[PDB]
Amino acid sequence: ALPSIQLPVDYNNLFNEITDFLVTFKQDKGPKYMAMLQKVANRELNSVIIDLDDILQYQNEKFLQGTQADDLVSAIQQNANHFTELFCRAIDNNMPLPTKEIDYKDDVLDVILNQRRLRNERMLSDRELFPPNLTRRYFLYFKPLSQNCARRYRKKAISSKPLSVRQIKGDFLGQLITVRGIITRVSDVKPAVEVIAYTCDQCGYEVFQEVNSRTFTPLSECTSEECSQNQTKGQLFMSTRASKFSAFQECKIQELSQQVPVGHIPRSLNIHVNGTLVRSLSPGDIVDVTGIFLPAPYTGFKALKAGLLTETYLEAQFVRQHKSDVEERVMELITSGDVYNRLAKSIAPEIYGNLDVKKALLLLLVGGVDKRVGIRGDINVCLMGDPGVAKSQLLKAICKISPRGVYTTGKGTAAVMKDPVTDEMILEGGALVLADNGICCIDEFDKMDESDRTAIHEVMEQQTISISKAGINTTLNARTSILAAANPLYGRYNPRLSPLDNINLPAALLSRFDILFLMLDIPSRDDDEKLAEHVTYVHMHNKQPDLDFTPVEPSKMREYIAYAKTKRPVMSEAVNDYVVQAYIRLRQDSKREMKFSFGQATPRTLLGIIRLSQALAKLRLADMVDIDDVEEALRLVRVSKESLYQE
Amino acid sequence: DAVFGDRVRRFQEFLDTFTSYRDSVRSIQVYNSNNAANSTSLNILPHRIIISLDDLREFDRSFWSGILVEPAYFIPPAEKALTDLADSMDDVPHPNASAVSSRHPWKLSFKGSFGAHALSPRTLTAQHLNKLVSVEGIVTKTSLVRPKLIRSVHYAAKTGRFHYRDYTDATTTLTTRIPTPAIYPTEDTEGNKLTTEYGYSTFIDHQRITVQEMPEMAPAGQLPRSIDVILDDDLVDKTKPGDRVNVVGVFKSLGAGGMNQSNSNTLIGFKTLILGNTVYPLHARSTGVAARQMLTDFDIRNINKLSKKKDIFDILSQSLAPSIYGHDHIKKAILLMLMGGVEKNLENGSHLRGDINILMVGDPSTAKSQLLRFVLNTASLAIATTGRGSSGVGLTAAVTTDRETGERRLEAGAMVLADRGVVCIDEFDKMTDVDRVAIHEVMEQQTVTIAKAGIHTTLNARCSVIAAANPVFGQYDVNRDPHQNIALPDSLLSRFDLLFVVTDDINEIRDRSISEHVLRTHRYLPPGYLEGEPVRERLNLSLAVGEDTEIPKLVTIPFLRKYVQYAKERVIPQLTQEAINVIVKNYTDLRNDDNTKKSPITARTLETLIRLATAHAKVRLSKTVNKVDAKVAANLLRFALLGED
Amino acid sequence: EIPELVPVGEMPRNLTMTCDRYLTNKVIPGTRVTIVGIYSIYNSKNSGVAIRTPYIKILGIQSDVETSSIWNSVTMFTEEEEEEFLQLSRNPKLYEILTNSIAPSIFGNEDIKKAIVCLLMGGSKKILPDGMRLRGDINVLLLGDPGTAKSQLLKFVEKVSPIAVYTSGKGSSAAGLTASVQRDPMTREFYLEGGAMVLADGGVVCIDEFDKMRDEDRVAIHEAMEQQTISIAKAGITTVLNSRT
DNA sequence: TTAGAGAATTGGAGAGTGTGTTTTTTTTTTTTTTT
DNA sequence: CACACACTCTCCAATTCTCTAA
Numbered sequence A: 001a002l003p004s005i006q007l008p009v010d011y012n013n014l015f016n017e018i019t020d021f022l023v024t025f026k027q028d029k030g031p032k033y034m035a036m037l038q039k040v041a042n043r044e045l046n047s048v049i050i051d052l053d054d055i056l057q058y059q060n061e062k063f064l065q066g067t068q069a070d071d072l073v074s075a076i077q078q079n080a081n082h083f084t085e086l087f088c089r090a091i092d093n094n095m096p097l098p099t100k101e102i103d104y105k106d107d108v109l110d111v112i113l114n115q116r117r118l119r120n121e122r123m124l125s126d127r128e129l130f131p132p133n134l135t136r137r138y139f140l141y142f143k144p145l146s147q148n149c150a151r152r153y154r155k156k157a158i159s160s161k162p163l164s165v166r167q168i169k170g171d172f173l174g175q176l177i178t179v180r181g182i183i184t185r186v187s188d189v190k191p192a193v194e195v196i197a198y199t200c201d202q203c204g205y206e207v208f209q210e211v212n213s214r215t216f217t218p219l220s221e222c223t224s225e226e227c228s229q230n231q232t233k234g235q236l237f238m239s240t241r242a243s244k245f246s247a248f249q250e251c252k253i254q255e256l257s258q259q260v261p262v263g264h265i266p267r268s269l270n271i272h273v274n275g276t277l278v279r280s281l282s283p284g285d286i287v288d289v290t291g292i293f294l295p296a297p298y299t300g301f302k303a304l305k306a307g308l309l310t311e312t313y314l315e316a317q318f319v320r321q322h323k324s325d326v327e328e329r330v331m332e333l334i335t336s337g338d339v340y341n342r343l344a345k346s347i348a349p350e351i352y353g354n355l356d357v358k359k360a361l362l363l364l365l366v367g368g369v370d371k372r373v374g375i376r377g378d379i380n381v382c383l384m385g386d387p388g389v390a391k392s393q394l395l396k397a398i399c400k401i402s403p404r405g406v407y408t409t410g411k412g413t414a415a416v417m418k419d420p421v422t423d424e425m426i427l428e429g430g431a432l433v434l435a436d437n438g439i440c441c442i443d444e445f446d447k448m449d450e451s452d453r454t455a456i457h458e459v460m461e462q463q464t465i466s467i468s469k470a471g472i473n474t475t476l477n478a479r480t481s482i483l484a485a486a487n488p489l490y491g492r493y494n495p496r497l498s499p500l501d502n503i504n505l506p507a508a509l510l511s512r513f514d515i516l517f518l519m520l521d522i523p524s525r526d527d528d529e530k531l532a533e534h535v536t537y538v539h540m541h542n543k544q545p546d547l548d549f550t551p552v553e554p555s556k557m558r559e560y561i562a563y564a565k566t567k568r569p570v571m572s573e574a575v576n577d578y579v580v581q582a583y584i585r586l587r588q589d590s591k592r593e594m595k596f597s598f599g600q601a602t603p604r605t606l607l608g609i610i611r612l613s614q615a616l617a618k619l620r621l622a623d624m625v626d627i628d629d630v631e632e633a634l635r636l637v638r639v640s641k642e643s644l645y646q647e
Numbered sequence B: 001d002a003v004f005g006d007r008v009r010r011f012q013e014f015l016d017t018f019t020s021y022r023d024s025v026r027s028i029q030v031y032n033s034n035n036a037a038n039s040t041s042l043n044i045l046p047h048r049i050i051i052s053l054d055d056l057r058e059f060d061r062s063f064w065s066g067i068l069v070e071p072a073y074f075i076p077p078a079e080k081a082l083t084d085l086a087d088s089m090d091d092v093p094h095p096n097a098s099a100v101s102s103r104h105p106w107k108l109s110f111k112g113s114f115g116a117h118a119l120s121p122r123t124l125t126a127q128h129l130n131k132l133v134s135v136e137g138i139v140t141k142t143s144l145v146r147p148k149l150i151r152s153v154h155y156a157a158k159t160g161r162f163h164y165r166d167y168t169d170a171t172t173t174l175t176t177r178i179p180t181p182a183i184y185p186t187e188d189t190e191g192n193k194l195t196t197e198y199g200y201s202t203f204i205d206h207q208r209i210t211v212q213e214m215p216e217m218a219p220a221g222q223l224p225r226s227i228d229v230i231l232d233d234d235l236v237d238k239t240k241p242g243d244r245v246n247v248v249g250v251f252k253s254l255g256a257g258g259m260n261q262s263n264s265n266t267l268i269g270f271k272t273l274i275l276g277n278t279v280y281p282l283h284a285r286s287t288g289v290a291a292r293q294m295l296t297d298f299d300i301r302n303i304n305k306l307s308k309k310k311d312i313f314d315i316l317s318q319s320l321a322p323s324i325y326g327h328d329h330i331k332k333a334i335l336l337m338l339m340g341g342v343e344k345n346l347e348n349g350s351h352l353r354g355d356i357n358i359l360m361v362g363d364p365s366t367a368k369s370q371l372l373r374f375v376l377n378t379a380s381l382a383i384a385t386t387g388r389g390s391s392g393v394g395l396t397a398a399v400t401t402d403r404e405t406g407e408r409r410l411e412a413g414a415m416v417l418a419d420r421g422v423v424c425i426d427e428f429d430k431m432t433d434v435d436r437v438a439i440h441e442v443m444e445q446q447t448v449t450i451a452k453a454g455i456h457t458t459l460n461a462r463c464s465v466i467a468a469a470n471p472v473f474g475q476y477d478v479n480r481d482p483h484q485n486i487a488l489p490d491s492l493l494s495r496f497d498l499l500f501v502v503t504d505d506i507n508e509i510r511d512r513s514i515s516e517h518v519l520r521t522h523r524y525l526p527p528g529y530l531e532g533e534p535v536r537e538r539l540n541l542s543l544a545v546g547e548d549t550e551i552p553k554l555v556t557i558p559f560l561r562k563y564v565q566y567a568k569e570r571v572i573p574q575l576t577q578e579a580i581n582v583i584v585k586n587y588t589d590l591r592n593d594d595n596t597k598k599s600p601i602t603a604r605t606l607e608t609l610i611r612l613a614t615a616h617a618k619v620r621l622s623k624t625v626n627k628v629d630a631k632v633a634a635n636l637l638r639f640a641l642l643g644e645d
Numbered sequence C: 001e002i003p004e005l006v007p008v009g010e011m012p013r014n015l016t017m018t019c020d021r022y023l024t025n026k027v028i029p030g031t032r033v034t035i036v037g038i039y040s041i042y043n044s045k046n047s048g049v050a051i052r053t054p055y056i057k058i059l060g061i062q063s064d065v066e067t068s069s070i071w072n073s074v075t076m077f078t079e080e081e082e083e084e085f086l087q088l089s090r091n092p093k094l095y096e097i098l099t100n101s102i103a104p105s106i107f108g109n110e111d112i113k114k115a116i117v118c119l120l121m122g123g124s125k126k127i128l129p130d131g132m133r134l135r136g137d138i139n140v141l142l143l144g145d146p147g148t149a150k151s152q153l154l155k156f157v158e159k160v161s162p163i164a165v166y167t168s169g170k171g172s173s174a175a176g177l178t179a180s181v182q183r184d185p186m187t188r189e190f191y192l193e194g195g196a197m198v199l200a201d202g203g204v205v206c207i208d209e210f211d212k213m214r215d216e217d218r219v220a221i222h223e224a225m226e227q228q229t230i231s232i233a234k235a236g237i238t239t240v241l242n243s244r245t
Numbered sequence D: 001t002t003a004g005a006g007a008a009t010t011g012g013a014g015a016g017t018g019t020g021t022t023t024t025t026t027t028t029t030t031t032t033t034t035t
Numbered sequence E: 001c002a003c004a005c006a007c008t009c010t011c012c013a014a015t016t017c018t019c020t021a022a
């Protein structure tokens, strides 16, 4: 038998209080929630976000005038699933009639309403039928309590404290909690059925079946009164037209590396977003998901197979992300600060020296626009450098400021197919596709195998990576700007040896790079002293030794690229002339020098010069490409070439 | 159930006699009440009382023997007595509408002396079944914490009444009862529909760790044996793999083991496992004390007194490995590595590691591996690794499948388990190149990344690696640069703070000194042993389970470990300008010097200088770095690079 | 089955056996035993028709090398034979008796026989207070011209020693000499299986044809010879076994 | 031959005995032949 | 383990049948 227990909650009084709250609450138009229900009746909104701050304010207001409440906020944070049904029932009771001419072109549910009502009425006079969830066209959610900063939050308001996946103990099941973590795997949207709309071949009667079990059994038996009394034994046919579906997405939230105790492994927690919250979560997110932590049961046969050990999921209710005024601000900064010399030092404030490398990194960050083909607007630079030089620090600084920027190493791109056996997903990405409209910081570029060599070669002159797993020949758009940080083999760079001999990169791949910098360290007497002072100051004060203008926000570069991308600075005819004689004399001096053959100016150097000039004008208003721009571009190109011949 | 009531009242009398347990229950209750009345707080004390078995034996020997011999009949009554005691003396506050329904029985934990029950997973035979035993060993696997149902509370929306239902399993309750199919009752007795009330039900966490005997305890010629403990509630997540542990619990069996028609001659046995009641974390290889050794006020006073010595660094260093003659600078570097520099979690994602890495490359038989073994035996958390016997998967993470839950899971490798510890990689150069990229990544950014089997995580490996390597040839060749002597890439040698080169130069005075020292070492006789008697080991030091100016030349190893723990926990040195002057002067001198042309000096040596100076500041217990700290760090680094003195 | 009893061109055949109560933990892998058992039958459900897996139910085990451990990690020597050993130890020519009885068929090689006696007895293990231990086992290498009876000496040492494993350098791998990580067919869980240097724990392992070992296999013996521990970090396992060989 | 009182049989629901699942080969070592 | 399927065991009232009915 089932015993009985005494619990002081009194659901009926709570329901009366709930109805009073939905009727008699007006935030400091009429009532807020009545206005929301009016909008719902107009079919202009299908999300009743029941805030808990509002319920707390309602309780506080009625505390001074009768205390006509039973701590609802503390009564639904303990059991939220039942109160979702209570709120839905209270909304159906107080649902206002529409106050708008809503088109009813697709009124299948209304058609079923009136049809079944007429069929019942023609015999009711003898001359609930509809499930409560079937009629609802809204989804109800809970917004957790905000910060209290008062004695009310005396360790209470468990939905106020963002927990981690490890701290979600088993005794929180059924409560309305919130977790903080990084999404890792969000599934595709699937229509989860809430109530089926079986129709019988005879007897005319359709019987509905509410289901929340992840698995059900079709009725297929006309148990209707007419069918049973006539013993027709009719079978039932599903009608997806008259059924009710809710979009279902099954996310999965991990925990941040700062929440994991030492020696442990990050945990994970399944999230079941459904309703209007679908597609609000993506794998590259850090969120504070608020939901009801519920024990999904192993209903079926593995049920008896396992036992009391349940599996849990978080029925998400509210997702809070963490991650022309700006145009005026950046315009004013342009007027005040010299972008050319300021943004360069802003990229790597904690990295001393190598200013021209930073200037080239600005051009890569902006990049010219030459989408028209006959070509490409992606700037690629490689820093051959030297062991012990802060190439990796520069790469990380670029990654942390460049939108859609990723950092990766040669030895641990490409792509993998169908990683999980169960779901059997198709065409999982890699590292180059993630930085589609961004930059890939390929550290240890020399130590990167032939497969990735071919992959990056395809990406570099195709902007689209492809696979040939099972003859599908599918491709992934990866228009990523490439930033390489290869380092010389046999340790330190040898200036005497030829540059391509020092690093195991084929001349075919290196020659396609728009600009190349060889930036090696030399033991000096003053540069090292300033470097040591800088690093030690950073260690003391945890902040850079600020000695000049150091802008921080990257939105200025975003504004510049978005501004001049539509502008597309058109090159001048005199510019084209000066660059054709520039190529002529460059090739002439390349011959007369031939010392290292890693120079012969090539059509690709002209394309790189054009795109660098385009990027420079793209930074400075529109159509600024003139002699002034091309002189700086050619100066940068010549300096980069000379860098290969340093000392 | 007259016997049940008799046991309950006898244990109530015992609890009344020894008022310390009542005081502990009162303390737990007031702590919970104050936390409930007082915010970003989650520290709630569990409903668990640790009773000493010695007190129970002295009070009622019959009850004590019943607990130790047939706990399935004596522990439930004692737990019920404890629950009744806590309820009677409870402050009877206002209900929270959940504690009334959610059961919170007061569990019991035991300590004290066990005698014949102080066992190990190898010596845990079938004659110990259904008895309360304590097993000591190393945790190797830990299942995922998965909540399990023990009571479901239902609300019938037709009578306004609440109906519950208790659930029992073989792994939850000691006494055997009819298992429940774990299906919620969807209909009442009187044809009423019921809705399950989550949040008024009761779920308890459930974990299944695996404890195996210590590898050094295994008999000659056999691999360690393991047992499976089933921790639940407050004892979940108390242990992680690699932890030396001492689990107290009831050695239970389950199943029909054949005897089910399906098996007539089949000769399989029953599934046996321990229902853990207590987890006591003995650690640090000292066989009886925790890794975080308790610090008495006398010990802290003595530590502070010794920190004032002018040559505390020399005393601590020379006291590290007294059996290893010479290698004073390597000992100093090892001690500095034991208390690593402060770790800087800068903004914009920057992260400056505070762990010191030491590489020792040199001629054979120069105590390169005995120093590693000593670091293993001394550091609070050290993991032994060898070049040949370790793969990248075995060093970072292995994608295995959980057996308790049946799903894919990551298992921490040998160099994630050593998080916040040290890794002693012996025979470093023998590692295969495919298995060397992993340690390169870890020493680079101190986190491993996993991208296999549809798993994308980033485990934390903040370990300081000390490695011993051999030259490319048999012995170090002074006629070649220190690049072709070592078979490792410079991109990997750059991650080692100190690269000590040891040479077995053949002298005559030094050879005499070393021979005399080694012969003195080989004549050592243990205190409780006769001459010419083999040194048998029993390690049966488990007499009890649970917690039951000055200028010395050499400090004892346990005191050295206490000092290291105190220095790591307490003092967090901060850099100072007076030390930075020395640091920058020495770095500039080292960089642009003719003799240092062969040296690989880069900007990393500056960070090494800062880390060594901060470590030496930790040695002095000074909360700030001084000129002497930077001077000593510079001298040590100069010896590591040049080696003149 | 005994290697000298297998038929011509046949692999050795295994046989599942069951102990019970006081006959358990009585033998260790590698020991040669004589069993008095009941050749019984059980139908394991794991591929013909009406087939039955055979096994022996042990009723008595008569090893020749003592029980688990050596003499069960203690002395199980009858008083008469202990007195015999004491009488033997007082023999003034005990060294010559032991030397002359090491491979009596090998002419000469007196020094190698003396070194083999020293190897069989072994040194004395020490464990210092600071933690580091000093091994007490002797390793002997026999270089020389072919036909000098090195392999015969190794084969005899494999007999006289209470615990011994004979392996050839050619047919021997690093994971098969120290410890092999294997996957359990049923439970899908990795576990270790001891190699030659674990089977010969507490004894001597004779590695014939030493110079034929692959360069990456001979290295695995470096730790197990001096430190006398085998460190494994593979497939989520992290243990430091013991090999006092 | 017709509207109506008697025998005689057997199909459609249900008591019940025994079934049938969930249930898995990924990833990681170790070997071996070519490369 | 238990819920759902397939099916042997088992069983009375509506459906057929032939002696006595109109």
Ligand SMILES: Nc1ncnc2c1ncn2[C@@H]1O[C@H](COP(=O)(O)OP(=O)(O)OP(O)(O)=S)[C@@H](O)[C@H]1O
Binding pocket: A350, A351, A352, A353, A385, A386, A387, A388, A389, A390, A391, A392, A393, A487, A531, A535, B490, B491, B494, B603, B604, B607
């Ligand atoms: N110009 C610089 N300014 C500040 N810190 C620097 C500078 N150059 C080097 N460093 C320091 O050098 C370290 C980072 O150097 P890395 O970029 O790792 O050298 P590396 O050339 O990448 O080494 P690898 O792995 O052989 S490529 C950090 O400790 C930096 O603080």
Ligand SMILES: Nc1ncnc2c1ncn2[C@@H]1O[C@H](COP(=O)(O)OP(=O)(O)OP(O)(O)=S)[C@@H](O)[C@H]1O
Binding pocket: C105, C106, C107, C108, C144, C145, C146, C147, C148, C149, C150, C151, C152
């Ligand atoms: N001094 C000896 N006394 C007796 N028999 C001997 C002696 N020297 C050699 N032999 C015999 O000569 C053969 C030597 O073969 P092995 O000893 O097996 O090979 P080996 O001596 O190890 O040389 P290897 O292995 O090819 S380097 C055996 O048949 C021995 O019995």
Ligand SMILES: Nc1ncnc2c1ncn2[C@@H]1O[C@H](COP(=O)(O)OP(=O)(O)O)[C@@H](O)[C@H]1O
Binding pocket: B323, B324, B325, B326, B327, B363, B364, B365, B366, B367, B368, B369, B370, B371, B514, B517, B518, C134, C135, C226
């Ligand atoms: N400086 C030293 N002082 C004392 N003993 C030493 C010293 N160097 C080597 N030994 C002895 O050499 C033996 C083996 O040393 P080991 O750790 O194998 O060195 P490696 O690993 O470099 O070969 C040890 O037992 C140790 O006692």
Ligand SMILES: [Mg+2]
Binding pocket: A391, A392, A443
């Ligand atoms: Mg780098």
Ligand SMILES: [Mg+2]
Binding pocket: B368, B369, B426, B427, B468
């Ligand atoms: Mg060594």
Ligand SMILES: [Mg+2]
Binding pocket: C150, C151, C208, C209
């Ligand atoms: Mg031979």
Ligand SMILES: [Zn+2]
Binding pocket: A200, A201, A202, A203, A221, A222, A223, A227, A232, A233, A234, A235
């Ligand atoms: Zn029908």
